[PDB]
mmCIF file of C-alpha atoms and ligand atoms in Angstrom:
data_model
loop_
_atom_site.group_PDB
_atom_site.id
_atom_site.type_symbol
_atom_site.label_atom_id
_atom_site.label_comp_id
_atom_site.label_asym_id
_atom_site.label_seq_id
_atom_site.Cartn_x
_atom_site.Cartn_y
_atom_site.Cartn_z
ATOM 1 C CA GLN A 231 7.750 -6.689 16.802
ATOM 2 C CA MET A 232 9.223 -9.267 14.363
ATOM 3 C CA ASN A 233 11.751 -8.886 11.527
ATOM 4 C CA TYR A 234 11.895 -9.651 7.808
ATOM 5 C CA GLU A 235 14.702 -12.210 7.673
ATOM 6 C CA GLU A 236 12.815 -14.613 9.973
ATOM 7 C CA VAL A 237 9.174 -14.144 8.947
ATOM 8 C CA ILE A 238 10.250 -14.564 5.323
ATOM 9 C CA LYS A 239 11.103 -18.215 5.943
ATOM 10 C CA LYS A 240 7.655 -18.820 7.462
ATOM 11 C CA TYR A 241 6.295 -18.401 3.902
ATOM 12 C CA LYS A 242 9.188 -18.059 1.439
ATOM 13 C CA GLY A 243 10.910 -21.303 2.191
ATOM 14 C CA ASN A 244 13.245 -20.370 -0.666
ATOM 15 C CA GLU A 245 12.402 -21.224 -4.277
ATOM 16 C CA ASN A 246 13.511 -17.940 -5.814
ATOM 17 C CA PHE A 247 10.695 -16.453 -7.839
ATOM 18 C CA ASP A 248 9.868 -15.113 -11.271
ATOM 19 C CA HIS A 249 10.905 -11.453 -10.868
ATOM 20 C CA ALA A 250 8.881 -10.498 -13.950
ATOM 21 C CA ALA A 251 5.286 -10.325 -12.717
ATOM 22 C CA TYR A 252 2.939 -11.123 -9.864
ATOM 23 C CA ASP A 253 -0.192 -9.011 -9.366
ATOM 24 C CA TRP A 254 -2.391 -9.202 -6.286
ATOM 25 C CA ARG A 255 -5.326 -7.619 -8.132
ATOM 26 C CA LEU A 256 -5.794 -11.155 -9.521
ATOM 27 C CA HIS A 257 -5.381 -13.535 -6.557
ATOM 28 C CA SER A 258 -8.007 -12.158 -4.169
ATOM 29 C CA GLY A 259 -5.472 -9.749 -2.709
ATOM 30 C CA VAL A 260 -6.684 -6.231 -3.542
ATOM 31 C CA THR A 261 -9.669 -4.392 -2.090
ATOM 32 C CA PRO A 262 -11.370 -1.539 -3.936
ATOM 33 C CA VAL A 263 -9.791 1.891 -4.212
ATOM 34 C CA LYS A 264 -11.294 4.652 -2.096
ATOM 35 C CA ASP A 265 -11.213 8.443 -2.303
ATOM 36 C CA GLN A 266 -9.626 10.363 0.562
ATOM 37 C CA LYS A 267 -11.248 13.451 -1.000
ATOM 38 C CA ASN A 268 -10.010 16.650 0.655
ATOM 39 C CA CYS A 269 -7.973 15.604 3.718
ATOM 40 C CA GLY A 270 -4.326 14.558 3.929
ATOM 41 C CA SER A 271 -4.905 11.122 5.439
ATOM 42 C CA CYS A 272 -3.180 8.705 3.050
ATOM 43 C CA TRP A 273 -1.228 7.263 6.008
ATOM 44 C CA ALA A 274 -4.628 5.998 7.136
ATOM 45 C CA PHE A 275 -5.867 4.617 3.812
ATOM 46 C CA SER A 276 -2.506 2.990 3.100
ATOM 47 C CA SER A 277 -2.341 1.154 6.415
ATOM 48 C CA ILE A 278 -6.024 0.169 6.470
ATOM 49 C CA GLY A 279 -5.541 -1.003 2.902
ATOM 50 C CA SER A 280 -2.631 -3.309 3.707
ATOM 51 C CA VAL A 281 -4.626 -5.043 6.443
ATOM 52 C CA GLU A 282 -7.725 -5.368 4.274
ATOM 53 C CA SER A 283 -5.451 -7.295 1.904
ATOM 54 C CA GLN A 284 -4.003 -9.562 4.592
ATOM 55 C CA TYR A 285 -7.518 -10.519 5.708
ATOM 56 C CA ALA A 286 -8.579 -11.268 2.140
ATOM 57 C CA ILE A 287 -5.554 -13.574 1.711
ATOM 58 C CA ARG A 288 -4.690 -15.230 5.019
ATOM 59 C CA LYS A 289 -8.340 -15.697 6.112
ATOM 60 C CA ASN A 290 -10.200 -15.017 2.795
ATOM 61 C CA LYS A 291 -12.785 -12.461 3.994
ATOM 62 C CA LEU A 292 -13.864 -9.193 2.308
ATOM 63 C CA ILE A 293 -13.933 -6.075 4.512
ATOM 64 C CA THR A 294 -14.061 -2.309 4.210
ATOM 65 C CA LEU A 295 -12.719 -0.703 7.374
ATOM 66 C CA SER A 296 -13.261 2.734 8.840
ATOM 67 C CA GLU A 297 -10.234 4.845 8.017
ATOM 68 C CA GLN A 298 -12.271 7.518 9.803
ATOM 69 C CA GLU A 299 -11.970 5.819 13.207
ATOM 70 C CA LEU A 300 -8.208 5.782 12.627
ATOM 71 C CA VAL A 301 -8.007 9.542 12.047
ATOM 72 C CA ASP A 302 -10.193 10.280 15.070
ATOM 73 C CA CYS A 303 -8.311 8.005 17.478
ATOM 74 C CA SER A 304 -4.725 7.549 16.210
ATOM 75 C CA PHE A 305 -2.849 9.962 18.444
ATOM 76 C CA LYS A 306 0.710 9.372 17.287
ATOM 77 C CA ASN A 307 -0.641 10.668 13.925
ATOM 78 C CA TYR A 308 -1.845 14.219 13.482
ATOM 79 C CA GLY A 309 -5.282 13.607 11.943
ATOM 80 C CA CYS A 310 -6.148 14.964 8.500
ATOM 81 C CA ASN A 311 -2.879 16.941 8.625
ATOM 82 C CA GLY A 312 -0.721 13.862 8.145
ATOM 83 C CA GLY A 313 0.687 10.792 9.789
ATOM 84 C CA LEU A 314 3.137 7.938 9.529
ATOM 85 C CA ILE A 315 2.506 4.301 8.689
ATOM 86 C CA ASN A 316 4.186 2.530 11.616
ATOM 87 C CA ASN A 317 2.614 5.032 14.035
ATOM 88 C CA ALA A 318 -0.763 3.944 12.637
ATOM 89 C CA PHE A 319 -0.079 0.219 13.007
ATOM 90 C CA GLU A 320 1.124 0.885 16.558
ATOM 91 C CA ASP A 321 -1.973 2.916 17.420
ATOM 92 C CA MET A 322 -3.936 0.205 15.584
ATOM 93 C CA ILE A 323 -2.913 -2.548 18.003
ATOM 94 C CA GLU A 324 -3.383 -0.264 21.020
ATOM 95 C CA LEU A 325 -7.004 0.221 19.941
ATOM 96 C CA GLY A 326 -7.294 -3.527 19.378
ATOM 97 C CA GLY A 327 -9.086 -3.370 16.043
ATOM 98 C CA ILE A 328 -11.078 -0.960 13.901
ATOM 99 C CA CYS A 329 -14.761 -0.801 13.040
ATOM 100 C CA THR A 330 -16.341 -1.978 9.802
ATOM 101 C CA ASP A 331 -16.411 0.898 7.302
ATOM 102 C CA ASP A 332 -20.221 0.661 7.404
ATOM 103 C CA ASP A 333 -20.862 1.093 11.144
ATOM 104 C CA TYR A 334 -18.219 3.868 11.155
ATOM 105 C CA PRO A 335 -18.201 5.482 7.721
ATOM 106 C CA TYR A 336 -15.672 7.889 6.271
ATOM 107 C CA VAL A 337 -16.351 11.627 6.113
ATOM 108 C CA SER A 338 -13.129 13.260 4.861
ATOM 109 C CA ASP A 339 -12.081 16.532 6.603
ATOM 110 C CA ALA A 340 -15.428 16.847 8.379
ATOM 111 C CA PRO A 341 -14.833 17.065 12.146
ATOM 112 C CA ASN A 342 -15.898 13.839 13.807
ATOM 113 C CA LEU A 343 -15.519 12.376 17.262
ATOM 114 C CA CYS A 344 -13.515 9.289 18.096
ATOM 115 C CA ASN A 345 -16.183 6.819 19.271
ATOM 116 C CA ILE A 346 -14.962 3.269 19.897
ATOM 117 C CA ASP A 347 -18.501 2.267 20.923
ATOM 118 C CA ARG A 348 -19.955 3.000 17.464
ATOM 119 C CA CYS A 349 -19.734 -0.650 16.327
ATOM 120 C CA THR A 350 -20.027 -4.103 17.877
ATOM 121 C CA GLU A 351 -17.314 -6.508 16.657
ATOM 122 C CA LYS A 352 -13.955 -5.146 15.558
ATOM 123 C CA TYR A 353 -11.111 -6.273 13.310
ATOM 124 C CA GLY A 354 -7.529 -6.173 14.557
ATOM 125 C CA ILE A 355 -3.982 -7.050 13.637
ATOM 126 C CA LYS A 356 -1.360 -8.891 15.663
ATOM 127 C CA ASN A 357 1.902 -7.230 14.639
ATOM 128 C CA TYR A 358 3.666 -5.314 11.877
ATOM 129 C CA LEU A 359 7.152 -5.447 10.410
ATOM 130 C CA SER A 360 9.386 -3.341 8.205
ATOM 131 C CA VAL A 361 10.590 -4.350 4.755
ATOM 132 C CA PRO A 362 14.216 -3.767 3.771
ATOM 133 C CA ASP A 363 14.699 -1.364 0.883
ATOM 134 C CA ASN A 364 15.605 -4.238 -1.471
ATOM 135 C CA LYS A 365 13.727 -7.509 -1.015
ATOM 136 C CA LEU A 366 10.478 -5.893 -2.201
ATOM 137 C CA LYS A 367 9.461 -8.284 -4.979
ATOM 138 C CA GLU A 368 10.342 -11.171 -2.663
ATOM 139 C CA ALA A 369 8.139 -9.670 0.056
ATOM 140 C CA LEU A 370 5.084 -9.072 -2.140
ATOM 141 C CA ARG A 371 5.143 -12.454 -3.869
ATOM 142 C CA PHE A 372 5.082 -14.271 -0.521
ATOM 143 C CA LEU A 373 3.857 -11.854 2.191
ATOM 144 C CA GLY A 374 1.415 -9.520 0.440
ATOM 145 C CA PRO A 375 0.721 -5.876 -0.342
ATOM 146 C CA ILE A 376 2.744 -3.237 1.469
ATOM 147 C CA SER A 377 2.253 0.270 2.829
ATOM 148 C CA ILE A 378 4.958 2.696 1.723
ATOM 149 C CA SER A 379 5.969 6.343 1.482
ATOM 150 C CA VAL A 380 6.829 8.368 -1.617
ATOM 151 C CA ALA A 381 7.691 11.795 -3.028
ATOM 152 C CA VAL A 382 5.223 13.384 -5.420
ATOM 153 C CA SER A 383 4.827 16.208 -7.927
ATOM 154 C CA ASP A 384 2.057 17.936 -9.837
ATOM 155 C CA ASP A 385 3.079 16.118 -13.022
ATOM 156 C CA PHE A 386 2.177 13.085 -10.911
ATOM 157 C CA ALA A 387 -1.509 13.902 -10.447
ATOM 158 C CA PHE A 388 -2.246 14.098 -14.177
ATOM 159 C CA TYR A 389 -1.254 10.443 -14.700
ATOM 160 C CA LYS A 390 -3.743 8.396 -16.711
ATOM 161 C CA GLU A 391 -2.053 5.309 -18.210
ATOM 162 C CA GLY A 392 1.078 3.257 -18.931
ATOM 163 C CA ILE A 393 4.503 3.536 -17.328
ATOM 164 C CA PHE A 394 5.202 6.714 -15.394
ATOM 165 C CA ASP A 395 8.698 7.828 -14.433
ATOM 166 C CA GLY A 396 8.211 11.585 -14.586
ATOM 167 C CA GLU A 397 8.943 14.311 -12.063
ATOM 168 C CA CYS A 398 9.432 13.170 -8.457
ATOM 169 C CA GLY A 399 9.427 15.288 -5.283
ATOM 170 C CA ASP A 400 11.754 16.960 -2.825
ATOM 171 C CA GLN A 401 10.951 14.627 0.075
ATOM 172 C CA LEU A 402 8.433 11.959 0.937
ATOM 173 C CA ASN A 403 4.963 13.435 1.039
ATOM 174 C CA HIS A 404 2.311 10.738 0.475
ATOM 175 C CA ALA A 405 1.615 7.180 1.635
ATOM 176 C CA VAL A 406 0.172 4.436 -0.565
ATOM 177 C CA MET A 407 0.147 0.696 -1.308
ATOM 178 C CA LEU A 408 2.309 -1.675 -3.338
ATOM 179 C CA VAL A 409 0.203 -4.406 -4.899
ATOM 180 C CA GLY A 410 2.563 -6.157 -7.285
ATOM 181 C CA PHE A 411 5.032 -6.004 -10.136
ATOM 182 C CA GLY A 412 4.894 -6.697 -13.840
ATOM 183 C CA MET A 413 6.404 -6.107 -17.247
ATOM 184 C CA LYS A 414 5.296 -5.326 -20.798
ATOM 185 C CA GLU A 415 7.747 -5.792 -23.658
ATOM 186 C CA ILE A 416 7.603 -2.409 -25.409
ATOM 187 C CA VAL A 417 9.577 -1.497 -28.530
ATOM 188 C CA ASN A 418 11.962 1.481 -28.199
ATOM 189 C CA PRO A 419 10.410 3.703 -30.917
ATOM 190 C CA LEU A 420 13.882 4.823 -32.073
ATOM 191 C CA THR A 421 16.075 1.722 -31.976
ATOM 192 C CA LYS A 422 12.894 -0.357 -32.438
ATOM 193 C CA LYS A 423 14.051 -3.392 -30.487
ATOM 194 C CA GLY A 424 12.578 -5.669 -27.866
ATOM 195 C CA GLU A 425 12.992 -3.781 -24.606
ATOM 196 C CA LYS A 426 11.598 -5.218 -21.389
ATOM 197 C CA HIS A 427 10.098 -2.441 -19.240
ATOM 198 C CA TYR A 428 9.471 -3.501 -15.649
ATOM 199 C CA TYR A 429 6.906 -1.747 -13.495
ATOM 200 C CA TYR A 430 5.485 -1.723 -9.981
ATOM 201 C CA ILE A 431 1.687 -1.679 -9.641
ATOM 202 C CA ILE A 432 0.157 0.765 -7.174
ATOM 203 C CA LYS A 433 -3.136 1.606 -5.482
ATOM 204 C CA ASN A 434 -3.935 5.180 -4.512
ATOM 205 C CA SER A 435 -6.591 6.930 -2.424
ATOM 206 C CA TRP A 436 -8.170 9.272 -4.994
ATOM 207 C CA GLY A 437 -11.043 7.331 -6.546
ATOM 208 C CA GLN A 438 -11.472 5.107 -9.577
ATOM 209 C CA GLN A 439 -11.722 8.255 -11.731
ATOM 210 C CA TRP A 440 -7.956 8.765 -11.343
ATOM 211 C CA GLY A 441 -5.224 6.934 -13.257
ATOM 212 C CA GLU A 442 -5.834 3.353 -14.413
ATOM 213 C CA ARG A 443 -9.259 2.788 -12.837
ATOM 214 C CA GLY A 444 -7.657 4.067 -9.608
ATOM 215 C CA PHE A 445 -4.152 2.580 -9.885
ATOM 216 C CA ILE A 446 -0.853 3.657 -11.461
ATOM 217 C CA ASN A 447 2.319 1.886 -12.589
ATOM 218 C CA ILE A 448 5.967 2.898 -12.139
ATOM 219 C CA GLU A 449 9.051 1.717 -13.962
ATOM 220 C CA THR A 450 11.714 -0.300 -12.204
ATOM 221 C CA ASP A 451 14.080 -3.168 -12.996
ATOM 222 C CA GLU A 452 14.073 -6.950 -12.832
ATOM 223 C CA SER A 453 15.923 -7.028 -9.518
ATOM 224 C CA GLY A 454 13.283 -4.574 -8.301
ATOM 225 C CA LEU A 455 15.707 -2.042 -6.798
ATOM 226 C CA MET A 456 14.965 1.007 -8.945
ATOM 227 C CA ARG A 457 12.890 2.761 -6.288
ATOM 228 C CA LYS A 458 11.773 5.731 -8.330
ATOM 229 C CA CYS A 459 10.852 8.766 -6.235
ATOM 230 C CA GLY A 460 12.430 7.374 -3.073
ATOM 231 C CA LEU A 461 10.149 4.367 -3.345
ATOM 232 C CA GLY A 462 9.529 2.495 -0.119
ATOM 233 C CA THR A 463 12.203 4.065 2.063
ATOM 234 C CA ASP A 464 9.536 3.788 4.739
ATOM 235 C CA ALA A 465 7.843 0.450 4.076
ATOM 236 C CA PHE A 466 5.858 -1.685 6.516
ATOM 237 C CA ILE A 467 3.310 -4.481 6.134
ATOM 238 C CA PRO A 468 0.819 -5.770 8.755
ATOM 239 C CA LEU A 469 0.549 -9.350 9.973
ATOM 240 C CA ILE A 470 -2.143 -11.372 11.741
ATOM 241 C CA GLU A 471 -0.247 -14.676 11.982
HETATM 242 C C1 LIG B 751 4.843 8.530 5.420
HETATM 243 C C2 LIG B 751 4.727 10.048 5.538
HETATM 244 C C3 LIG B 751 6.097 10.624 5.168
HETATM 245 C C4 LIG B 751 3.616 10.545 4.605
HETATM 246 C C5 LIG B 751 3.090 11.957 4.960
HETATM 247 N N1 LIG B 751 2.701 12.849 3.870
HETATM 248 C C6 LIG B 751 1.410 13.532 3.779
HETATM 249 O O1 LIG B 751 1.228 14.242 2.844
HETATM 250 C C7 LIG B 751 0.293 13.375 4.824
HETATM 251 O O2 LIG B 751 -0.366 14.603 5.005
HETATM 252 C C8 LIG B 751 -0.732 12.311 4.411
HETATM 253 C C9 LIG B 751 -1.455 12.619 3.087
HETATM 254 O O3 LIG B 751 -2.446 11.921 2.729
HETATM 255 O O4 LIG B 751 -1.076 13.544 2.321
HETATM 256 C C10 LIG B 751 3.361 12.632 6.316
HETATM 257 O O5 LIG B 751 2.604 12.482 7.212
HETATM 258 N N2 LIG B 751 4.538 13.478 6.466
HETATM 259 C C11 LIG B 751 4.843 14.164 7.714
HETATM 260 C C12 LIG B 751 5.000 13.200 8.892
HETATM 261 C C13 LIG B 751 5.122 13.978 10.204
HETATM 262 C C14 LIG B 751 3.764 14.126 10.893
HETATM 263 N N3 LIG B 751 2.891 14.992 10.109
HETATM 264 C C15 LIG B 751 2.511 16.327 10.552
HETATM 265 N N4 LIG B 751 2.988 16.866 11.815
HETATM 266 N N5 LIG B 751 1.755 17.027 9.832
#
């Protein structure tokens, strides 16, 4: 099932890397945000997202995949009423690929039937691995976007721009994607001095209407270990090589 410390070398080598910014939105690494509408199925959109990114990097093809199929057929995940990321990736391999999002479109909380035969050629993974709670920035820069868990509040929903570090949550309650890291030098309005504010860049599952054209940023530090709102305690990324 592979581990970080080995697979890292396959790509990292070991240059050490600018911990300030790398953003997959800009190197053919980020597929478009989608809207899970009413239905608690982020676990599905997060996982399907992370693979969509691996395909667009490691084999440079654009694909939208049926997160619906996943809800209907992933049995170690409890449909629209929740699920876990690894469980998805496990069920993913068992199914041996998922249908194009066109042959098998998404329909939110509408009851639908698992139907493997609905499409012709399918798109699989080969394995998945877990990321340690620290080497995040190292992972992203070299491996790609990640699927991760997080704790959320109602303050959270109303986000619309800039750095957020507001109210978190009691325990992890939503699954989404890491897509990079960055930094804007912003001037402390009181001391009025060059302060470097580091942020993680994120993709959600609530439409382009929400946040920054669908995304949202969160403060952190240069090392990348400020994991605000229990960031990435569960954290896996899919591989196809
Ligand atoms: C990575 C995990 C922690 C995320 C998750 N949180 C949720 O809110 C899910 O309903 C998915 C969602 O989109 O909201 C979740 O599924 N939590 C519970 C996991 C246990 C299985 N879920 C059941 N039995 N409802």
